[model samples]
Target: SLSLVDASWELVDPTPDLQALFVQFNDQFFWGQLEAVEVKWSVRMTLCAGICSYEMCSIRLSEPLLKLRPRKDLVETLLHEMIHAYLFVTNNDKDREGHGPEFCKHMHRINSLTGANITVYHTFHDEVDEYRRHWWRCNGPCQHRPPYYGYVKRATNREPSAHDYWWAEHQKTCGGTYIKIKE
Candidate 1:
């Protein structure tokens, strides 16, 4: 499981430094775990945020998301999102619940491959913990805990956004290029 330290906005710049981080992260966490897929890095104007979905071969990292405190568990989060991309491209749709059985199964599989347990037991957001407790009647939930797990529905029906289209175009040109940090 990965844990969050604090949310800072410092590592959010889309500069070359940030790009390097993306490349390093992908190579270390996602490459080889996935087959015949390409990963690209792109900067979005939006605040700190990160998302991995279908129809895009790129990872959009907001400067803000990186700036947030030093998240030692970032590699696991990246792996989680990449798993989403993997399932999406492979056409797996039997499970729809985030953090459900299927998601955990994949997480374990990835862990086997990486030789690292990637589970998050803590809430990435304080409010989410409060919300869950308010609704589920739990108390003193752990926030910023690691090894948190969840699932995302099949994006098969969702329309691709402009960024997705751009990634598609790049994929067409490169036939799924894997991103790496230049020495």
Candidate 2:
């Protein structure tokens, strides 16, 4: 009956609560198309409100930041990431990258159907900036490429992880280190 869309919606225990809601939303909105992925809360994810990792087949919501927000905000954030998952699972070749045409099409459809306010950008930039004060500068030749002159802002206070898509290529191409900057 779309209980989540009710104005009285509230979170009880986010872990299982969101997981159950995802299943409900899937059945109603996605035509049960998406495979059930692990839904988790992230304590260290202050850079973004929510993220869907297709590689991990999981969705992570920023617990530290998002838990305090309104229910509508949280629902919209989940739906936002869900669209990414939907696109990946369906193998929409044209919209494989960031929020592209297919993503918008699904987002608009879901919004219209469920009365959700979904958008590409989040409204937590101020809180996000607080944690991102710690920055790192990549001392690599890749920095001198077309994007920027010297700095490459990727992580907050840590070096790029080995699992990063560009890590292997960067090692072969640049082999340079990163320095903590903007103290």
Candidate 3:
């Protein structure tokens, strides 16, 4: 009974409608081949609209982010993540993590068949900036460098991440201490 052609199709909440949408997508686009997986709303996910967790076998959609976007984004993100889940469950995941030939093939096919504009990276920046409230600036010669001067990072955390590979080199070359201007 679900049709993507419905112009008025929209999702107001991720709680109850997610699985229903997944089931319909499974039936319509996936030939009902995909197994059922938990669909949960994510609060911490600010960059991506949706993520398919292989270990958890669940689809986590950014509630705070997607809720603010148009309905088209919600459907596209759901279907995109479902494709990842499909590849994982079917054991056809051989590409770079997930966006390999298999994934791209399906994305292209689905877009052509359904007129859905799905891409690997989301262009939405509203939620990205909203979460990156912590701003850090460098206080050295490197700060004067063109194209991303002064401001070194704007992340969710005040301190640099433990795995920042460039941190040591930045400190050595610039000898600049970071000052947090925003929190």
The top-ranked prediction according to lDDT is 3
Over 4 Å off, model 3: 1-16, 126-183
TM-scores of the models, in the order given: 0.44, 0.63, 0.62
lDDT per residue for candidate 1 within 46-161, as digits (tens), equals 31134443343434433433445334334455556666665666566457454557567777876765555566343355554433331110011111111110111121333223
Candidate 2 or 1, higher lDDT = 2
Summarize candidate 2's per-residue lDDT along 2-74 as a digit string, tens digits: 4346644544334346777788778888888876666677776664577655443567777766777777777
Off by over 4 Å in 1: 1-48, 111-122, 128-183
List the global CA lDDT of all models.
Answer: 0.42, 0.67, 0.69
Please identify which of the two predictions, 2 or 3, would achieve the higher lDDT against the true structure.
3
The runs of at least 3 residues in candidate 2 whose Cα sits more than 4 Å from the true structure, single-residue gaps closed, are 1-6, 9-16, 126-183
Quote model 2's TM-score: 0.63
